[PDB]
Design a protein around this ligand. Sequence first.
Ligand code: MG
Ligand code: MG
Ligand code: MG
Ligand code: MG
Ligand code: MG
Ligand code: MG
Ligand code: MG
Ligand code: MG
Ligand code: MG
Ligand code: MG
Ligand code: MG
Ligand code: MG
Ligand code: MG
Ligand code: MG
Ligand code: MG
Ligand code: MG
Ligand code: MG
Ligand code: MG
Ligand code: MG
Ligand code: MG
Ligand code: MG
Ligand code: MG
Ligand code: MG
Ligand code: MG
Ligand code: MG
Ligand code: MG
Ligand code: MG
Ligand code: MG
Ligand code: MG
Ligand code: MG
Ligand code: MG
Ligand code: MG
Ligand code: MG
Ligand code: MG
Ligand code: MG
Ligand code: NA
Lengths: 69, 136, 94, 58, 116, 75
Amino acid sequence: IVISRHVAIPDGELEITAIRAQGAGGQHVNKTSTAIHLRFDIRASSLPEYYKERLLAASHHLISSDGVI
Amino acid sequence: MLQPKRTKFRKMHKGRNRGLAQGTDVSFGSFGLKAVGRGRLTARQIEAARRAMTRAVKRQGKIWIRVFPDKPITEKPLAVRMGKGKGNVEYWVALIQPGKVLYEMDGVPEELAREAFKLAAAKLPIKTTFVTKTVM
Amino acid sequence: MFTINAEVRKEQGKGASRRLRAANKFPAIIYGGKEAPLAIELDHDKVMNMQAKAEFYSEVLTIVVDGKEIKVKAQDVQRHPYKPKLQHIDFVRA
Amino acid sequence: AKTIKITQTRSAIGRLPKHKATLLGLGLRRIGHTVEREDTPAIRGMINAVSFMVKVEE
Amino acid sequence: DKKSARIRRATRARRKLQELGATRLVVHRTPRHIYAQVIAPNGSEVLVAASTVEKAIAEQLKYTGNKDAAAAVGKAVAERALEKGIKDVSFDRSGFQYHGRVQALADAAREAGLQF
Amino acid sequence: RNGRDSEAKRLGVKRFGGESVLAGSIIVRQRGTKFHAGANVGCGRDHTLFAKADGKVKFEVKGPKNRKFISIEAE
RNA sequence: GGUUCUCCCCGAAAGCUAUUUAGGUAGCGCCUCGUGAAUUCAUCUCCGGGGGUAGAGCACUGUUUCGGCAAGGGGGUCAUCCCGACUUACCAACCCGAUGCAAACUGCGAAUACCGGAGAAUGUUAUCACGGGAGACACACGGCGGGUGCUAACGUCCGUCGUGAAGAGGGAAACAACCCAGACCGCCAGCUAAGGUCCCAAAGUCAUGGUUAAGUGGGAAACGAUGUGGGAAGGCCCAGAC
RNA sequence: UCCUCCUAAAGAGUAACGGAGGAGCACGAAGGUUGGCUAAUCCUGGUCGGACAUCAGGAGGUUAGUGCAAUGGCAUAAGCC
RNA sequence: GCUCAACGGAUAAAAGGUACUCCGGGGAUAACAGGCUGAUACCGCCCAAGAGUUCAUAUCGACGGCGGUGUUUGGCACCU
RNA sequence: UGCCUGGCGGCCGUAGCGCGGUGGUCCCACCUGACCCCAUGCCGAACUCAGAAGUGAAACGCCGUAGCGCCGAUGGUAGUGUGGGGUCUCCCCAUGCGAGAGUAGGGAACUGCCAGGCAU
Ligand SMILES: [Mg+2]
Ligand SMILES: [Mg+2]
Ligand SMILES: [Mg+2]
Ligand SMILES: [Mg+2]
Ligand SMILES: [Mg+2]
Ligand SMILES: [Mg+2]
Ligand SMILES: [Mg+2]
Ligand SMILES: [Mg+2]
Ligand SMILES: [Mg+2]
Ligand SMILES: [Mg+2]
Ligand SMILES: [Mg+2]
Ligand SMILES: [Mg+2]
Ligand SMILES: [Mg+2]
Ligand SMILES: [Mg+2]
Ligand SMILES: [Mg+2]
Ligand SMILES: [Mg+2]
Ligand SMILES: [Mg+2]
Ligand SMILES: [Mg+2]
Ligand SMILES: [Mg+2]
Ligand SMILES: [Mg+2]
Ligand SMILES: [Mg+2]
Ligand SMILES: [Mg+2]
Ligand SMILES: [Mg+2]
Ligand SMILES: [Mg+2]
Ligand SMILES: [Mg+2]
Ligand SMILES: [Mg+2]
Ligand SMILES: [Mg+2]
Ligand SMILES: [Mg+2]
Ligand SMILES: [Mg+2]
Ligand SMILES: [Mg+2]
Ligand SMILES: [Mg+2]
Ligand SMILES: [Mg+2]
Ligand SMILES: [Mg+2]
Ligand SMILES: [Mg+2]
Ligand SMILES: [Mg+2]
Ligand code: NA
């Protein structure tokens, strides 16, 4: 929701879905959607430049090649 | 954010909200916003109403908040079982009975009075009206 | 000098007074002095109009009961909590 | 002296134990059952206690 | 002060006597003219009160307000009590320390019939 | 934390006014001298008021402090 | 898990306390059988009782707003040296006035309930004691007072009442616990309760006034609107208004 | 396990993995009894000495204390000698 | 003479694993699913500070509020 | 019989506090003195003793005084038992009980026994 003392996330630019986890767990991890899958567009979010720019000028495994985290 | 500076106990019972109200007649200002309904006013609500009210008028006028939350309402964290003790204080509310004058105001023409009080009552979960100070 | 008609409260108490206030009247009590205070029922719309004037309480009033006329000053009034209504008034004789 | 005739008009089923005992202290057993009792203040109070399920013809 | 201090000193034993229900003999010393009384358990009426302030005991003494005058008063209340049939009483210091004039009165009355 | 308590003591007024008693029969159990020892009524170390004569209880407001006393009238 | 012929009579509990105890058991509470005994018991009225709950209040414990106030504080008028004057442009204790709030606040304080006494009526002794026999200690919903929970739950845990359990019949379409109501048996007899009366489907297309235009009736909030019925006043206006 | 308040619905009782605290002792004087005494705070003075010791007066009126928690008491003091 | 304190104390004296497992029971009680609820989730609406060159309502909407759905994770443990 | 005073009470603020006034024949109080009876955790302050020289100044009693304190109606409201109903975490209706606060006002205590002084 917040990063620095100045920039923050209004949650109106951050969609989350509840999907299933992996690995062990029994008949629970099968049905129950307990893992979180978070998507966050940067190109079209209320973030400053030098944040949008600095993300899109990076190579992190969380950042998709389409400017979405 | 109104709050009891150094209360006595942290958590208190839910209780009830039966009866009519006591802060009923306009005491301080020329006019006021009586509560026709019944319920609770979170500190966030009182703050938003006071801001929506003190901005509709400029720094002109004077406003009295005849309500103060002084009741800690607790909620359990998300995804917990029942039991294991009472929750944790998360906000403070003032129980409002029909008749409690929530905001008094003076120093502005009744035009600004009614307008600001409508702008404020838009931010409250409880029916309100507009009352004038009465005599005898 | 506001003239106010009236009637003696036939039966008194909470239930009767609530029936009264539902009948578009309301009670009031004239006391002050040595005579027994007079329990009065009296119309609501007239009186709620009268009290709207800033003179209703500063001046004197002529309560009419069985032809009798009483000069009184409204000492104390029980208003409704949130409705523009009156529940009761203390009319002090003289 | 003067007696008074009392009937039952409602069921004593969903009634409080005080009212069960009061109907017993009147002598009423059924709905429509009628009895005759001395008209004493104790009896008149015993009636206005269950005034909702007893009909009186003084 | 002085008066209420002594009175609260007395209140304890006064109330204890009022509890025990005894016909209590009371003493009120005073820089002059020591007084004495005898009051029934209900405490609203006395039976014997022989104090120096009576002119029968006035002249017969040098100074009302010495242990000797107190002894005369004690003998006087004792005689009047044995006249009133009161054999025994319970002494009341009334806050006064049972040392000087009050002790003189008490010893006198004790030797003069009253079984307190 | 919380969760503790103590078994209730069963204090109170075991005998009320106008209530015949025997000698020594307890009348009031209490902590303080909320009710004070009147005539024919004792006061145990528990501040328990008990009877000192077979009579009838009586509550009064004797005294300048209005403290309530409990007498027993052998009626 | 199962436990086998019949009728009649009474008929519970799912609570407390303790338990390597929690789904078992033991005493007691509740049922039954026998005996004994007292207005012994209940209800109503009166009389004597103690409370500190609801409500209220803010003297107390805190808490809260506004204002007046001001010891002090801290600046300069100060060097106007033992000492105090002013001001503070300001900072404010205490106190006062006006406004609320409290399960763990109370100088106030019910209704009820409970205890005790007396008085009649009624109750198949309705009561207590002992003895034979138990069962039961998994309770549920509804109302009322609550904690907890989210002033969520057919949630949970308490107090109290009712019901189901262990009670059928009528109503709520259907619907253990809601409303009416307690089934000994038979009747092709009647009056009623809740609930109903156009047809399914027994009973009013009932009578008098009203309202609703929505199929509202026959799901729902903030809020919004010349919807329409009413009431009370007003403003301007035949010195002719809108 | 025991104690105190509240929940607990003005008799008793009353549950929660409900809300707030405590104890597993101390004392031959901290008990008995007799006698005596009366607090906290603030103000004004007054050697350091200050906001705050001690001294005095005043206001106050028990807002102190109660060997240790809370409640209930406690001026006849249960408080201090 | 016992922190027999698990404090009505079962012995003077006793810790674990089991996915190699077994038996007796339970939906009295969990995992899945259905259920009641709707915190959470999602969706809509009210207010309008502001942003929108000026202009709140093209578009967006602070501080706050009112609901709907029953897609999530929960809650309860009602069915198995 | 009237007043004043002292003791012991009933009663516990309609009785207390304040403000103004007044009292010394008796009483009471202050007071004088203290080797002593006794006394201080130092002090004849207090307690105690031996007396009254002096004063009602303080104290206390009494009178007036509402400035508080206190008491306190009548109605109305709140709450509530029982029955019923709703638009139901809140109410309404029929009935019974009915406050609290506040208001009008009241309010400068009343009183028994004994003893003394004075009037008589
Ligand atoms: Mg009513
Ligand atoms: Mg129980
Ligand atoms: Mg309350
Ligand atoms: Mg069991
Ligand atoms: Mg059980
Ligand atoms: Mg409930
Ligand atoms: Mg069963
Ligand atoms: Mg049935
Ligand atoms: Mg049926
Ligand atoms: Mg059916
Ligand atoms: Mg249905
Ligand atoms: Mg029924
Ligand atoms: Mg039959
Ligand atoms: Mg018929
Ligand atoms: Mg038909
Ligand atoms: Mg429809
Ligand atoms: Mg209780
Ligand atoms: Mg109770
Ligand atoms: Mg001690
Ligand atoms: Mg002593
Ligand atoms: Mg001691
Ligand atoms: Mg145990
Ligand atoms: Mg064991
Ligand atoms: Mg292997
Ligand atoms: Mg198996
Ligand atoms: Mg099975
Ligand atoms: Mg499930
Ligand atoms: Mg289940
Ligand atoms: Mg369950
Ligand atoms: Mg299923
Ligand atoms: Mg003189
Ligand atoms: Mg002297
Ligand atoms: Mg003088
Ligand atoms: Mg009152
Ligand atoms: Mg006489
Ligand atoms: Na007014």
